[PDB]
Amino acid sequence: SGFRKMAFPSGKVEGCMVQVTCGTTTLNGLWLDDVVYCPRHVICTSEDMLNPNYEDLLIRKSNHNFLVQAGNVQLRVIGHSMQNCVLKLKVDTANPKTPKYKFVRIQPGQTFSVLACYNGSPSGVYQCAMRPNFTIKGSFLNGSCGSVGFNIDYDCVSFCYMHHMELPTGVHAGTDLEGNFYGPFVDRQTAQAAGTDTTITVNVLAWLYAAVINGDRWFLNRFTTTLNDFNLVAMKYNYEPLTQDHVDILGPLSAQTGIAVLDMCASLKELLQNGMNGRTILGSALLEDEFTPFDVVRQCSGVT
Amino acid sequence: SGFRKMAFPSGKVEGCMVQVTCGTTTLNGLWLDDVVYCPRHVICTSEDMLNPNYEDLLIRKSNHNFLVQAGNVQLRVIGHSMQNCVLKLKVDTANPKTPKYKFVRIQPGQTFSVLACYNGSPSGVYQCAMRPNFTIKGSFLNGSCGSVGFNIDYDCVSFCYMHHMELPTGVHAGTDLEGNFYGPFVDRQTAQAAGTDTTITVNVLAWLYAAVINGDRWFLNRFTTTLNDFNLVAMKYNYEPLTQDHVDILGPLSAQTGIAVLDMCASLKELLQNGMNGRTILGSALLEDEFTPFDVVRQCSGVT
Ligand SMILES: Cc1ccncc1NC(=O)[C@H]1CCC12CCC2
Ligand SMILES: Cc1ccncc1NC(=O)[C@H]1CCC12CCC2
């Protein structure tokens, strides 16, 4: 028993982290097979970042200008290309520690682990969610760009995120591993609005199921609701509208606990309308939305 | 910016996790050099665990009864010994992935990362604190015994905890790597009381300093206090009495922010006496005590 914000074991990703230097800028690279992936802003000086012309800036760089260092040893760059907002540096050596991997574009509301890195070195790992507004509330300082987000299915690492930017509001923005930004963001030092974020309803309900499984049951009530009634309340409290697809994914948790999904929504409704009244659920005094139904089933069953 | 409950990169520890089977019981082992460390209750059947005589139970076991499997390959056991509550199995092969390591006994209030494992395989990593009552609020299911807690100083892994038991109250108990239990617990299926726990005051103050650094400043007030006045409030709210040693460790955070430690205590005092009034600090609606002053300085500076 017990329920923690658990990250995936970061070992397979640690073996891929490299340092990439271009001119005076240093950031993190992801070495998979004979390719190093990093944010294209590695080629910019702080002055360039105001309104960078990436095609022009890259034209002044050669393979020899990209210094790639894996731990202590140097990698030889034999090719460079820009794909959207990432640079792909072809190296002459395939990474011996390349795990089985996939590049996937996650949906908003999905979760992943971030291995925060500086100068090619990992400092820590944490589990976070991709916000409905495509930002992530991470922990990133100057030098963390190129750090990646991932999920792990047995031996396969699905890379889903690469860190690029910190918005003026302190929230984080980045791309998938093909250099496509999540959200409307651009890799430019300009004010950029993150749209209205919402709470991930299905994840809060999944976390309420994890609480029941672990013993926190005080929020369970004698009430039920409908998808229409619940969604009226969800809209009032800036929660994502719950759909039958969300109810279907909650199926296994509903089956294990014997608590119908609409009954759990009625508990969530009363918590949204009344608050916690000074109590906690799984050691939290607010409604947690960073555990998907899949994360809860995994942690509650022991999937390794 | 941003502040997360960050765990250490678990790579060096993943390479040490093995599976240990004895009879019908399987749990996790820690392979360092030519020795495998695991909880001694691996030699017990569920019936034995009511009142086990470990010396007698171990006497019926030989090196060949301890099946140690590292991922897929089998390790040959050439020796076995009981040290307090752990078994030390001498194997004929030194682990090639043995990192630089130390065995340390942490103090209550200190934090560490846990690499949760099942059948020798890692499922996740999370950061937690050793409670003042020597329990940990972990996430552990049947099969997680032998999972370890650690800290990392550059390339050295300091092992501080091995999971052994889940108390009837759902909280966790375990030993240092010499088999010495933290707290009054015994590896026996008997009711055992975890003493009155308290909130780790210095860590809450460290977390208040991390909030100021990241922008959450609403809790800062025009007041100050004394160690005596603050400690009267701390006792009323079941907080650890703050000492000059705690104030001295908060020194670097006090210097960086320009907020005197006793001024931060006055903010904590008003939060303890008034609550949060529906607001949050670093995304939390309660006072977080699982970040030490060292954890905050590290995350806020980028120590890798
Ligand atoms: C200082 C910092 C901290 C964390 N993450 C990111 C940053 N900074 C940035 O995002 C800057 C570096 C060039 C940039 C990309 C858009 C403009
Ligand atoms: C079921 C479980 C889950 C998590 N952690 C631990 C356990 N269980 C135990 O602690 C049992 C197994 C033998 C034991 C040690 C004292 C009696």
Side-chain angles (χ1 to χ4, degrees), chain A:
Chain A
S1 42
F3 207 74
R4 280 282 175 173
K5 184 67 66 47
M6 195 172 289
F8 284 106
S10 61
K12 296 171 192 321
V13 188
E14 286 162 61
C16 314
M17 303 311 303
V18 302
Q19 171 191 83
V20 181
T21 298
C22 194
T24 71
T25 304
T26 298
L27 44 66
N28 307 284
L30 185 70
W31 184 21
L32 292 170
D33 301 315
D34 64 339
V35 178
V36 174
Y37 303 88
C38 75
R40 71 182 179 170
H41 77 249
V42 69
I43 75 181
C44 305
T45 70
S46 77
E47 300 96 292
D48 289 315
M49 289 310 305
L50 288 179
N51 189 12
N53 188 321
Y54 287 100
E55 284 291 358
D56 292 355
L57 294 171
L58 187 54
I59 281 167
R60 304 296 189 231
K61 303 294 186 185
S62 304
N63 301 327
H64 70 259
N65 298 134
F66 293 100
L67 307 170
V68 185
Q69 199 179 320
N72 305 304
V73 286
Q74 204 74 13
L75 298 183
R76 185 177 301 277
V77 180
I78 66 186
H80 69 265
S81 60
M82 183 156 52
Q83 175 173 30
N84 298 311
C85 300
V86 297
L87 270 169
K88 297 191 292 196
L89 314 168
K90 202 201 183 186
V91 292
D92 74 353
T93 302
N95 184 4
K97 304 181 190 156
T98 299
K100 296 188 184 182
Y101 76 98
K102 284 195 183 157
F103 283 174
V104 311
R105 189 166 173 95
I106 54 150
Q107 291 299 337
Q110 300 301 106
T111 58
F112 59 89
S113 301
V114 174
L115 177 69
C117 301
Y118 297 89
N119 301 120
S121 292
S123 43
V125 61
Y126 60 87
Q127 181 78 359
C128 74
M130 168 68 62
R131 298 311 311 167
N133 72 354
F134 292 101
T135 61
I136 68 158
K137 302 176 171 168
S139 178
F140 290 112
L141 299 173
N142 187 306
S144 63
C145 300
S147 298
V148 301
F150 61 95
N151 283 280
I152 310 179
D153 200 351
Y154 170 47
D155 62 346
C156 182
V157 180
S158 294
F159 293 100
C160 63
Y161 175 87
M162 173 166 284
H163 183 61
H164 284 241
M165 176 175 70
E166 169 167 84
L167 295 198
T169 64
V171 308
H172 306 111
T175 72
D176 57 29
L177 269 294
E178 292 187 351
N180 300 115
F181 262 91
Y182 286 93
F185 315 111
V186 288
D187 51 351
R188 191 194 153 145
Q189 183 63 239
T190 207
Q192 287 171 60
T196 312
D197 196 35
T198 48
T199 304
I200 314 136
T201 316
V202 62
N203 294 357
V204 172
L205 286 165
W207 168 87
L208 286 176
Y209 276 111
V212 174
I213 292 172
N214 285 289
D216 296 345
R217 323 167 51 93
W218 68 264
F219 54 82
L220 298 180
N221 61 33
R222 322 179 146 271
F223 317 147
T224 198
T225 182
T226 68
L227 263 199
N228 298 128
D229 177 60
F230 181 82
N231 284 344
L232 288 184
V233 175
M235 189 162 55
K236 189 206 164 124
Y237 291 90
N238 292 83
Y239 264 64
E240 277 292 311
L242 203 74
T243 66
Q244 184 59 50
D245 284 0
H246 294 133
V247 171
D248 291 349
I249 310 170
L250 291 166
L253 296 173
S254 175
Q256 211 201 301
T257 70
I259 307 174
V261 174
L262 293 172
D263 283 12
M264 197 56 102
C265 297
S267 293
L268 179 49
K269 170 173 158 198
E270 295 306 283
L271 291 166
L272 281 172
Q273 295 173 336
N274 301 339
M276 323 256 303
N277 271 113
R279 299 182 298 276
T280 65
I281 303 173
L282 297 165
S284 183
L286 51 78
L287 297 147
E288 295 292 326
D289 73 350
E290 293 193 311
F291 295 106
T292 71
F294 305 91
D295 295 338
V296 172
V297 176
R298 185 191 294 116
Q299 200 183 142
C300 294
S301 72
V303 172
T304 57

Side-chain angles (χ1 to χ4, degrees), chain B residues 222-252:
Chain B
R222 322 179 146 271
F223 317 147
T224 198
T225 182
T226 68
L227 263 199
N228 298 128
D229 177 60
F230 181 82
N231 284 344
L232 288 184
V233 175
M235 189 162 55
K236 189 206 164 124
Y237 291 90
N238 292 83
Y239 264 64
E240 277 292 311
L242 203 74
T243 66
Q244 184 59 50
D245 284 0
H246 294 133
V247 171
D248 291 349
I249 310 170
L250 291 166

